[model samples]
Target: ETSGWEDALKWLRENTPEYSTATSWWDYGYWIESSLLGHARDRDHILALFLARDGNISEVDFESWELNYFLVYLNDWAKFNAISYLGGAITRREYNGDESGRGAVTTLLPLPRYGEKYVNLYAKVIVDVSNSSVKVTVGDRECDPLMVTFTPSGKTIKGTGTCSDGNAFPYVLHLTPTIGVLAYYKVATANFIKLAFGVPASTIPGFSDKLFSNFEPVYESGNVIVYRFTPFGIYKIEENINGTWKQVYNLTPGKHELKLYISAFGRDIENATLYIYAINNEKIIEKIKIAEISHMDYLNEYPIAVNVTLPNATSYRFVLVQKGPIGVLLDAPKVNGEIRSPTNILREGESGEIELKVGVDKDYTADLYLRATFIYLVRKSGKDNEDYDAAFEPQMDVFFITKIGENIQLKEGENTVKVRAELPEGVISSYKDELQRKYGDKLIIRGIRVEPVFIAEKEYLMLEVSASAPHH
Candidate 1:
């Protein structure tokens, strides 16, 4: 530890409550212990705290460890390899761009306002880097530099350029008199390097203030900075029913396309992995990991969607383990829809209506599936009495699963639909007489289950729904 680190420790010892727990990389365990500060164990948890951005850092992990403060020193940046190696979750990747002067520098900057065919444009030629001016040729076309940014001092110089394309060149080259010219690119692997360099989040290419939303700088002295973790939480939860998005209080049973909106205090972060746990009696039963399938840019908040498969009756909770250095958890709300039982009974030649009431706050067409099971009980013939316990068990049972109506249009507020349930011909042909003998043993609507059609298409469910249920 250096003088500045010792200074920060002394400040923590004097300023904060006594014995308040703090965590950091394992290298500082002894240093924290010697200072009369409580050190939290578990290498993975603290490592995650260091590497994770917003949305993935589990607040439960912080609360469970009772961590009051986390310390990150300039030395920790150099020790990222050792820390990541011990963490063992993500492999260490090369995060630095090769530096060169006379040679062409491949930058991470993408060509501005162009189609996907041309992926990225690198600085094929560099003319000079003085008075905040830089001119480079991209491919065969020479790029007239618009603005140049100087690191550490954050100085900018403007140069003239229309480049015949009518757009000023977007690439920003990081250069000094001594180090020569290098193309700047931001990748996930370079996050530690950026933090180590101690530039403002905005100055770090491909990074923003949102990435540090949870990090509250408490004390900064020399090369050491002490930060406290702010709790990460959900800003809003919405569900995509059929195709329209609606704000929902709880998730309904079946396959759900859901959008979970989180605030980075207003910015974007890396993609996240959702950990879904089956909750029973407020305890986790089993867990499954769901990767984020898609995301959208919402003003002030970023929305990511995950496809979820939930059982008919189970409580679930979600904890997001993001690709970055943060993890967070949300108590998932569970809900179910009820089907009103049939009013009147049905016979061989008759049918009954199964009523379902679906309520929503927004107007949307519901693509629903109804699986109604019709059960009937009949008495066995006396001829079978020789082999069976006819006196004790003289009853015979039969059932059939029938689909009623699907792809119904529902507006805002309460919308009711009736499902027609008829006895199958095969069931009536085989058991009609037996059913008639039980003194009007009509086919009873045993149970009505509403399940999503696209449970696991794996291949074909997406296309078939269009042919069978046509809106046009």
Candidate 2:
């Protein structure tokens, strides 16, 4: 359970990166602890402490007995002694410590602020049943006394007419929090590739420009490396965040490949267009899928390829815009055939959708260069004096069957139209039937499946095709 609990949270921290509120992590952590630790007795004890120490628990009703006791425990200093603050911010990590049970560690640091939110000094705590008064303080000394009443237990007043409210907190509350990079160490393999904003571009790849013109530099509050419509600008930095900004990759030229790792959480979501382009000496050359969300796997470790003609680019950049409802995490992209942990793991999307496959029946034509979106077997018969139109376009839905001509138009690179589903139902039927007659009809429906992915935070649909089986 100890190992599992820690492991679960490590995964959760990645899956639920919105550290502004621990509600999601806590809510999910409860289940994890229950399953992993299997200790579900007593509503909570240290749970409340965990919440408060992490961040804003203001909207919470701390007066609830489970938390009430926890709040009492907060002042004990035995466990919380390591936490002392200066005017609501942290001054000393603790009060009485070391040699004489006291010492001045000195440097005063403020409490951690997350976005527009931070841990406030106000609190409604429950002391022991014997104590009638409580004192709240800031920095150097105690300011005054707090009018606090001790409760026996449970949610209601139990008919005690003090203050006149049914529920208090689980309702409202107070706190001082811990922030800053919740750092951890990954194995840091050699293939790890990361490109952040803020630092000059030249620091990464051999690009001519240090900062690309498309992005503007900016800053904001909280300073947490967060993803949202940053109150800042196009490109920005934090002395902190270690450097998780920007959209550039210092990749080696040649058909560099990649896999993406990402996640969309809470109100943080997006089905937005992602720009994955490559630049050479600062000249933007290679560009792929800037029009639709279908071209990317999004969060959830999905595989996608970016075909760059090198020396099309020595540097690559990707930009994600629009915010709220989704947040994305990018995996250290694997290039060429390099394998990274959990490479290309696909969750089930619509694994079996019927697709209408349209293509020609023939062999290989090295001269045939059929390129188009929403495709399958496409090329003009005897296209380009080389005369190469070996049917079976070698591409699907998002791949390129493609719908069908009219619903389709195969190009010859020569800009010549090869064929069209413009074929009437009769002609199309006659054509397919003719193919079936001449060749033993290898085309048939199979259990078609596409990968499950994310757009905004929601599970976006699969953009792959359910094509007809190839002719044997």
Candidate 3:
């Protein structure tokens, strides 16, 4: 009997150390310890006789140990530590020790006793207990099991318990008894405690120094060179010149052929009459009357056969004489080509040909003459033509067109005469100015009038006068 008691106590201590201590055991038996001890000693020495019955005492001790173990280790004990074994083994065991063992048990009862309160408490405690925190509550008072209070000041709390034995122990006793008294007591009273606390609500993460290593500010400045040209007259040449306003060439110097792009008011000077003059001597070099030319409407490139071997270093000035309705004349004349002088070199030449391309609308025959004076009647005769006498008094000469005359007699159709109008002596400024003024009007003159007596029948018959000029 004593051995069975000792063995039962030993098994209880190993499995449910909370009941091993006299304090916990006394606490658990607070309502029943004295009565039970008294009854065992009474009734024909029943307590001593019952202890003396070997099998019965051993069974009773085992039952008491199992009841304590269930209350501690299996009931609240397993739940407080979040252990899962109680629901499968302890909760399903029979209180009456039946073969099926399906009935709930409390204190290893001889009758079926469902520890519903203890089972509910165990479930609540299991949910509350966590690795970082644990919470237990009793009615209005809540507690952290580890901290022993509902609210903890610090981050975490650790709980420990000890038994009466000299062996090291847990600070909190867990009992496994057939009677689930401790578990039911905790559930009915709603006593709880908790362990851990969380991080403060105010705490937040922030960026550190040089968090973004590649951060940089972008900066940029733009630069551009704009080119522009202004129209100064009705007809002008629009060129993108160099810094010094000089014409750029791609060939070696001598006589280089080039095309002059003539424009007016940002558009091509179509049907514009061009008059080119040499800057050195103010000599008229070329004249282009583009009337029937097409696509010369906006920007036009006129081919210029420039003779570089002139007497002086010459800069060619271009004037747009005839302009269309929408054209504007440039305020300043545009320079078309330039010939720079090597040194102070002078080439003495007696005469040079003045090329002229005259357009004729109909067939007619008349003697083309060159005169020093603007008056046609004072033309020079015979030996005077052979005379290179610069001071032999100014006179008109019958300018024979040797090359051009062969093609001058048009066959009753539209024709053009390409003649070299030979100029004699000094510059024929008055005649050139008069002719320019006459042709400057939009209307083309058909015939010129002479003194009535100088006009012979044959000469009058050959020339069909369509319209008459003021002098005619």
lDDT of 1 by residue, 1-472 (tens): 3637667777787876444555555646356556555522333433433342212221123432235566766555444433433332222221221132222223233222222122233435434433234555556676665444455666766556445465545444433322222222221223332343333324433233433434556787776677654333344557786699986645545577887655442223335445666555556566667655344242335566878776433455555533211111111111123332222123334355545454443344434332222232222222331312121111113232344445466555555655555645444444544545544532222222222120111100000000111122
Error of 1 at 280 (Å): 46
**lDDT for each residue of candidate 2 in 1-472, tens digit (9 for 90 to 100):** 1423344345445543232122221244456456755611111212322222221211122111101011011112222222212111121212233345544222111223444333223322221112223222233333221122121221211222122233211111111223211000110000000111121211123121211221121111122121121211112111111334333323344443343322221112235555555555656566555423433221122323334333434445554444212111133222223322221221222011212211221111212111111111222122231221111111122211122223223222222222212111242234345444643432221112221111111122111111121231
The lowest-lDDT stretch of 10 consecutive residues in candidate 1 is 457-466
Error of 2 at 151 (Å): 40
Candidate 2 overall Cα lDDT vs. reference? 0.24
Q: For model 1, what is the alpha-carbon lDDT of residue 2? A: 67
- The best candidate by TM-score is 1
Task: Return the TM-score for each candidate structure.
Answer: 0.31, 0.20, 0.15
What TM-score does candidate 1 reach?
A: 0.31
Off by over 4 Å in 2: 1-249, 263-275, 280-283, 290-309, 312-314, 319-472
Q: Once superposed on the true structure, which residue ranges of model 1 sit more than 4 Å away at CA? A: 27-29, 32-42, 45-49, 52-63, 84-196, 200-207, 232-472
Candidate closer to the true structure by lDDT (higher is better), 2 or 3: 2
Model 3 quality (TM-score): 0.15
Q: What is the C-alpha RMSD of each candidate to the true structure, in Å?
A: 26.7, 27.1, 59.2
Candidates ranked by TM-score:
1, 2, 3
